[PDB]
Amino acid sequence: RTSLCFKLYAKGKHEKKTWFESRDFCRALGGDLASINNKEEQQTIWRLITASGSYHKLFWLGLTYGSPSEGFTWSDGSPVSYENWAYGEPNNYQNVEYCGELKGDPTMSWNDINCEHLNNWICQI
Ligand SMILES: OC[C@H]1O[C@H](O[C@H]2[C@@H](O)[C@H](O)[C@@H](CO)O[C@@H]2O)[C@@H](O)[C@@H](O)[C@@H]1O
Ligand SMILES: [Ca+2]
Numbered sequence: 023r024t025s026l027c028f029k030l031y032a033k034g035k036h037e038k039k040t041w042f043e044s045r046d047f048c049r050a051l052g053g054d055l056a057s058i059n060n061k062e063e064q065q066t067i068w069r070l071i072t073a074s075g076s077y078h079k080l081f082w083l084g085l086t087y088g089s090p091s092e093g094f095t096w097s098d099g100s101p102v103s104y105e106n107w108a109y110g111e112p113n114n115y116q117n118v119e120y121c122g123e124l125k126g127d128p129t130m131s132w133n134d135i136n137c138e139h140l141n142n143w144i145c146q147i
């Protein structure tokens with residue numbers, strides 16, 4: 023009753039999803055794509071990664087670009103109260119990168135990528 027819990031969805035290519043497909047999946051089970059709003063949540067997700075041996079994997083988070091006057095937003099509506107972008111990111115590479123992915127290594131860094139790319143994902147509930 024006092025927290026959301028996180029769950030990794032590491033998938034082979036035949037079951038990977040776009041950002042929107044991943045958001046729809048997490049919402050259909052009663053949650054949303056995961057937001058990382060502070061260092062505590064970052065640590066919780068890193069611990070899940072260490073527990074699963076799911077090392078060096080990339081995962082969709084709930085980061086998505088809104089209108090120009092909103093900038094990057096979290097799908098769950100939470101504030102962008104913490105940022106852990108990789109160096110130079112977000113860079114909107116070739117003008118087509120509007121969704122955020124986690125690099126699931128010890129840096130736990132974020133990168134904007136094309137929303138239609140197939141990826142693993144993380145839900146919260
Ligand atoms: O592929 C687009 C991506 O390319 C470059 O990033 C590289 C690396 O730093 C990333 O961690 C991995 C995983 O996304 O992708 C590339 O190998 C950068 O130009 C990056 O901004 C861009 O999104
Ligand atoms: Ca949160």
Ligand SMILES: [Ca+2]
Pocket residue numbers: 111112113114115119133134135
């Ligand atoms: Ca990028």
